[PDB]
Each structure stands twice: as C-alpha cells, then as structure tokens.
Design a binder for this molecule. Structure first.
Ligand SMILES: O=C(CO)[C@H](O)[C@H](O)COP(=O)(O)O
Ligand SMILES: O=C(CO)[C@H](O)[C@H](O)COP(=O)(O)O
Ligand SMILES: [Cl-]
Ligand SMILES: [Cl-]
Lengths: 220, 217
C-alpha cells in the first residue's frame, strides 16, 4: 500500500516538473511527495536559475544534489512554487503543515506568481477537516491558544518533540467543522500568538496535479 | 523629569495589587520602575509572568520566581507601558521589541493596566512608527505589502526578538481606525504580531501629567 502510494506521488511530482519550461526562480515545497520532485529536478538543471526552499529539510536535500539555495529576501519573487498538501478539497483549498513547514510554505505561496500542488488521490476530499489542522504558535501562547481552540469546538493536541524551523511549536487540531475554509483561516489568524495556521484558502492553489489510483493524471 | 512621572505612574498602578494574584509584568523603562516597586507587594504576588527576558532578568534579580505562561495559566492583572495611547485606550507598543509576548500576556489577562507619562498621550496613533514583528524570510515580501498601504517600513538592524524574529518599524501610516488596520496587518502572511493594541485595548490607563498628578482614563 505504501509502495503503491509512493508510485502515485512520483507520477504527480514528475508531471508537475514539466511546467518548468523557461528560466525561472523555482520555489520548492516540503514532504515525501516533494521529495520525488527534488529528485526529478536534476533533469531540469539548466532551466532553474534560482531555488528557494520552504524548509531546511528541503534545503538539505537540494544542496545534496548540488543546487544552490537562495534566501527569499535575495531571490525576490518566485515564478513557480511546487508543494504537497495533507488535504485538498473541491475548490483547491488545502490543509498543510503535516511536516511542520507550514509557515515558510505559506510565505512561499504568498510570494509566488503561480502555486502548483502535487497530491495522490488519498488526499482529495470534499470537505477539509478529517486530517487534523496544524497551527504554528508562539511557545508562550500555547495554553492560551489551546483554550481559544476549545471554545471553537476543536481539540488541540501539542505535537511533542517538534520545534519548527522558526523556533515555534505546533498544535494539531481535531474535530473542526471546516465547511468555510476562507472564514476559519481568517478567524485563526486573529488569535494572538498564532504564527500561521494550516489552511491554504485565502490564497489557494492555482493548479492541483492529482495522481489517481489507476496511475492517470487529473489536473484540477 | 520624565523619569519622575514614569515612577509616579508605576507606583500608582502597583496599588491595584490588592489580593493574592498571578501578576503579569510588561517591558520598558516605565515598567522598570514598577518592578522596583514590587518589593513592597511581595506577599500579594503569588505567581509572576514576564513578557520579556529583559523583565525576567530584572525580576529574578529582585528574588522573584518567574513562571512560564503555560504553567501559570491565566493572568489576573497585567501591567505594561506603551509607546502611544489614543483617546479610546488603544495603544502602539513594541518600541522595546517585546510586542509579541506583550500581546499574548494582554490576551491571557483578566485585566490590563497601561502606565504612561503624558508625552505618550495622543489624539491619533501613528507618529511613533508602528513596530511589526515578522518572520525573517518574509521581510522583503511584507515590506512591499506595507509600501502598497502607504507605509514606509524600516528594518530595525541588529535586533532579533526573543522569538527569533525581526522588526519592521513603519512610518507614515494613517491609523484613524486602529481596529481595522490591526485586523488587516494580521492577515499579511509572515507577520507574527503588529504593534497596535486595539482589538483588546487597555482596561485602565494610568497617566502621570506634567504637574505630577494622576489621570485615570
Ligand atoms: O505541508 C507540508 C509540510 O508541512 C507537506 O506539503 C504535506 O503536509 C506533507 O506532504 P506528504 O504527505 O506528501 O509528505
Ligand atoms: O511595548 C513596549 C516594549 O515592546 C514598551 O511597553 C513600550 O516601548 C514603552 O516603553 P517605555 O516605558 O520604556 O517608554
Ligand atoms: Cl496543548
Ligand atoms: Cl509584491
């Protein structure tokens, strides 16, 4: 089952790489699906002028393949950003942050002309929520924010032994009714001490490449 | 002169420590005079929470044990300074870089008392540049978004906040609607905290006048 899923991830990542057509500033996401993209990037080395990374994990992987990684402040604007997602609904709105890089991932999406999301079918849903929503919080505010999330009906679970690239901690929130991703993303952004929440809806994916169980490509 | 008014305001605020409480302590020079005054209320202060390592250091130097907010829970009273305070007790804070934890403390406090001298009282917030704590990676992106709004962002060099972030001090903002702009700035990706304290304003503001009187707003 895991070898099967890995095959679909590789298909989706490989397909997304074809969009690297011209000389561009490429932004690179985080996760296992992105891991197969990073490997594929060797075949597009002459097209990739500058690389920006959403995580030290991906940076480590990119540098290991000889790619120079440039800070977003010196790169400026990203032409194309490619990243995975934990969930994707019918309007290309995502839950992300399963691998903890959600802050820099959201910053990269914000500074990108175009955002392509690469998934296998298991991540496609009609309604976001079943996968617990990651929220990056200032360590000092963890208990306060946990309480505010309990008021909303969510059940926050502190992800132990995890410190994000930015020095923060993650709350994974269960039992949320997320029928209005736009509204709740806005809501969570107003809670003091929240750095970033895992809903990618205000600025959704421009294209979502999904590998089906039959090894076909669906472009949503 | 200004130091005298700061001490008066801080001393006055300390009188509100009446019962056994969890006290939250702000940051800055005005708060510095409060911390000194807290020796005279040692039996009333059960637990202390600090909005900065600077204040924590000062508190520990006076023998006060400082407890993390996660183990303290809820603060009964939080006392802090401000860079500006308008007519509706809405503040600009973050001149001393502790604005994130200061805002968290205010959010978790039953009551927030702000201590100022008269020089910080204004009719309209904005003249003092608005501090905004941002994720280092997003600094250039956020600077551009602030330029679109008409602000002029200046990176505060050689400053890394307690939380590992950097500060943009923003000039030329028209802040006639603090509530609206605070909400707006919170939606900009990469912004950790902005220096407007309006959505949850001060409950009481103690202001020392030029004539050394106390005005309770
Ligand atoms: O947002 C992310 C990291 O925080 C990833 O894109 C996603 O959460 C995990 O991707 P995968 O399931 O392919 O490993
Ligand atoms: O917000 C603050 C720290 O970030 C301070 O409360 C504010 O800068 C006032 O300081 P002072 O009393 O020294 O003028
Ligand atoms: Cl928790
Ligand atoms: Cl821009």
């Amino acid at each position: 089952k895991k070898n099967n899923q890995d095959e679909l991830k590789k298909l989706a990542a490989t397909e997304a790489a074809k969009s690297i057509t011209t000389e561009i500033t490429l932004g690179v996401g985080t996760g296992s699906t992105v891991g197969f993209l990073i490997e594929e990037l060797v075949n597009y080395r002459d097209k990739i002028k500058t690389v920006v990374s959403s995580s030290e994990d991906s940076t480590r992987k990119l540098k290991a393949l000889g790619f120079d990684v440039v800070d977003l402040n010196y790169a400026g604007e990203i032409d194309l950003y490619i990243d995975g997602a934990d969930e994707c609904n019918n309007h290309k709105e995502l839950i992300k942050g399963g691998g903890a890089a959600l802050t820099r991932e959201k910053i990269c999406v914000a500074a990108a002309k175009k955002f392509i999301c690469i998934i296998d079918e298991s991540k496609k849903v009609n309604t976001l929520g079943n996968f617990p929503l990651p929220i990056e919080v200032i360590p000092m505010a963890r208990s306060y924010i946990a309480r505010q999330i309990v008021k909303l009906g969510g059940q926050p679970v502190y992800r132990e032994q995890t410190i994000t690239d930015n020095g923060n901690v993650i709350l994974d929130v269960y039992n949320l009714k997320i029928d209005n991703p736009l509204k709740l993303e806005t809501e969570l952004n107003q809670i003091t001490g929240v750095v970033t929440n895992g809903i990618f809806a205000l600025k959704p994916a421009d294209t979502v490449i999904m590998a089906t169980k039959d090894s076909n490509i669906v472009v949503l």
